[PDB]
Amino acid sequence: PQPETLRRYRAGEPPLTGSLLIGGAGRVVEPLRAALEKDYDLVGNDSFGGLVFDATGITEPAGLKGLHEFFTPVLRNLGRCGRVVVVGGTPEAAASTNERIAQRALEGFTRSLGKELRRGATTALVYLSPDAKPAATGLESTMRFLLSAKSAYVDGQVFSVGADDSTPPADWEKPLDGKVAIVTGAARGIGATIAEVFARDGAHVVAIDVESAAENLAETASKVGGTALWLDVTADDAVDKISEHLRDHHGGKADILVNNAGITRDKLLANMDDARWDAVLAVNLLAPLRLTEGLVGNGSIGEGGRVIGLSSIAGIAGNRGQTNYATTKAGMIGITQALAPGLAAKGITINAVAPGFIERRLNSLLQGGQPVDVAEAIAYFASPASNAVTGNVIRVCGQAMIGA
Amino acid sequence: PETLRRYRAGEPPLTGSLLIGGAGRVVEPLRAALEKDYDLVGADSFGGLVFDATGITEPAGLKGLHEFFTPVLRNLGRCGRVVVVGGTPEAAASTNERIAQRALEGFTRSLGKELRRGATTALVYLSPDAKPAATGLESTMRFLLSAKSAYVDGQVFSVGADDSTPPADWEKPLDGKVAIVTGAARGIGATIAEVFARDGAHVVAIDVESAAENLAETASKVGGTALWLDVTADDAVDKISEHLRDHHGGKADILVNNAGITRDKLLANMDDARWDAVLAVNLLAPLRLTEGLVGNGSIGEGGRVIGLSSIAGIAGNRGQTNYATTKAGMIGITQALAPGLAAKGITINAVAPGFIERRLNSLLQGGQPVDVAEAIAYFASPASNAVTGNVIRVCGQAMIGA
């Protein structure tokens, strides 16, 4: 079982290499068909490039059967780098506990199916607010991202779409036309590729990196048709400096901020010095927070704004030698979750991307566990003293590597 | 691999001293609370390192984690326990405080991967509405600060605001309690019965009739009762309720939905039988038992529902689209029913067992920078205004996670 060469985005190419089957029952199927009919080859009863299942109509666990009924007969016809998407209803917003449970259970389904798919095929779960209007226009960008070569390395993940309508870009292939985007860490690596992708999608990019990036940063700004700003994002004056650059080049405004700049100072916590802790917190956590609040606070980024942070799987799973780094990346999730409410009021979205690997004894305790260990956790919940503990889900796994 | 210290009656909870530090609202209450039963310090190894992160109100403050742990970690004992206690981030007073407190999970999970000799880490969040004595935290801390938590490592616990009363004896906590344990004939269910019995509970041990012998056997080891039945049958609730009216004055305190089956199969090759049976036992049944027993008064104030989820339900597993669905569902039950059960004085929780006695992703390859950029480009879209607060891995579905 070798890796498939992942189909990636190329301009002008069809978004899927095969047909799109949209099934299921609920409030998404009709508009999603309506919305995708022209750009995608919709089929119903070649290979399937995408299978999309509306699970939003499943309102009790009993109805989970629909998943099986839809997928089993079609999975054998899924194409190279095919896309499986289940769309569900935000569980927390369900009309009933029955519906919440069924809609929550979907994620086990999609993550499991992800591990069954072949030839570079992926799964995604997308939840949509029950307050979305029937046209479900707020969902379209997610679906088109998923149902394209663009999402090539996004697999088994969960997306959450709110209630709001969306207007499409003039051109889905030039979706950031006209937009001004700041990308930190842009001289090289993922930063530089973000810049490029942004420029490719029509955005004007302000490429930020540290002064020592030198010509690398100028190469990036040159390549993407944008501007270079040399800057330490940790500096007190960083927001003023970027604010000035924006006044100079972009009428005092950016649309998009990507906090991509980050450093590692790996060291076990037992051997960690102040420098390696502080530097990593400064760049990875404090600077992005300060840039976001500075640039939103002084009106640089207003209504329609986008902030995207680089989190990390280390931030999610922890990593050895990376208590500093992982703290910052978990921090980045925290920024994302913490500011989302405030920024929404301002018409600004904040999201994070957590890259993984980008070019038994499987647990911290290095052993299988015993039944008593599971029992003990259950007895802890059972205790009359544990009345303040509810709604918890605790793995008894010796910190198994495996997870979401 | 360290031979893990497990609970034996009448040993000290930890093998060394307990250091409780930090600044915040939990340090003093916890010291005062744990001073008799533990060897509080504030040479010999630390059995326990507890750090109160609840004073950290902004990310600059996270330095505190480092200032506390770095100089003491080298002195952590065999099967030591590191616990960080924070404020529930959703409930912080400021975005700065939420961010910092949210950050702690990256810390604790990382450190967990650094500790040696069977030592573990935990994160406990405590509601900022908890009273100063933080009595509701105690059981969590004692569980963690003991050998009972041997295989629980890197996790996060979330403690609400309600006060607690300790059991009469922390080492017979379920004394006078009646526990219904399903799938109790064999395996994890049997051990749950054993541990409940050990802790003083009378266990009502349930399994299928084809398992009657092992069940009787289990009921006997635990001085409990064997009630065999199909939990998926319409009459399950009634039968259980009858047993309770007969033997325990119509009341149970604890329901553990442990019964489950696997019918593994790639979804492409799965028949209704493998799907439906898994659904029936693992999701429909526990939901029916729980609503059923709570609904008719069998489980009331002070009651506990504990469900068995599974790592498959969190991470997904190949060939278990069915089982994972039910196990994530079981998370669903836990989450969905918590608020309405809280109102009835009942808690519902789930345990998710792990293994109990570049290419590491579904896409079998590393990603490219463009893959990340595209995800970022998607959020950046003007048409992605309805998408906020999302965190999305770009990882080819890496095996690694929480």
Automatic annotation (TrEMBL), chain A:
Residues 179-356 form the Ketoreductase domain. GO terms for molecular function: oxidoreductase activity, acting on the CH-OH group of donors, NAD or NADP as acceptor. It holds the Pfam family adh_short_C2. SUPFAM superfamilies: NAD(P)-binding Rossmann-fold domains. InterPro entries: KR_dom (IPR057326), NAD(P)-bd_dom_sf (IPR036291), Sc_DH/Rdtase_CS (IPR020904), SDR_fam (IPR002347). It comes from the Bacteria. Belongs to the short-chain dehydrogenases/reductases (SDR) family. This is 3-ketoacyl-(Acyl-carrier-protein) reductase. It comes from Mycobacterium tuberculosis (strain ATCC 25177 / H37Ra). The gene is fabG-1.
